Amino acid sequence: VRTKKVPLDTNHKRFYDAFAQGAGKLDLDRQCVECHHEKPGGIPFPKNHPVKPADGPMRCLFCHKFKLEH
Ligand code: HEM
Ligand code: HEM
Ligand code: NA
User: Fold this and answer.
1) Where on this chain does heme b 2 bind (predicted)?
2) Rounded distance, CA 64 to CA 10, Å?
3) 66 forms bridges with which residues in the sheet?
């Protein structure tokens, strides 16, 4: 099935804007961890979600596309 896109909402608008301005996806991915992380606090990944790699950030934007894209 389809994997979920980045919500276009107040929580993610700055990433949409940064992306539109030329920000690299790896730099953006690093900022996602602020909220999307493991216990305690924040927004935990579901069971079975991929875990972070040794080299560089988990590539959020590779699997979770922005909406409004071409
Ligand atoms: C960083 C660029 C980033 C990504 C990528 C990302 C993705 C993401 C997904 C795929 C979801 C699930 C949406 C769904 O189930 O349909 C999701 C949900 C939420 N996020 Fe997020 N997110 C990124 C960054 C951040 C940051 C920095 C925050 C905190 C300010 C944040 C927060 C949230 C919240 C809350 C949700 C729940 C659904 C919603 O209200 O949007 N995300 N994110
Ligand atoms: C990068 C750190 C990253 C974030 C942020 C992120 C978010 C995220 C959320 C919030 C969910 C839950 C969705 C829901 O509530 O229904 C979620 C689930 C899935 N993800 Fe993810 N994800 C990040 C990284 C990655 C990477 C690198 C991949 C692919 C290798 C990936 C894929 C998936 C899949 C599949 C799911 C379940 C289906 C879905 O809900 O989209 N994520 N992710
Ligand atoms: Na990426």
Assistant:
1) 4, 49, 60, 63-64
2) 17
3) 6
Return the residue matching tokens 């993610």: 12
- How far from chain centre, in Å, is Cα 9? 13
Considering the four listed CATH numbers 1.10.3720.10, 1.20.120.450, 1.10.1130.20, 3.40.50.10140, the one that applies to the domain covering 5-67 is 1.10.1130.20
Pocket residues for ligand 1 (CB within 6 Å)? 4, 6-7, 9, 11-12, 15, 28, 31-32, 34-36, 43, 60-61, 64
| Method in brief | X-ray
Asked if 6 and 65 count as a contact pair (C-beta separation under 8 A), the reply is yes
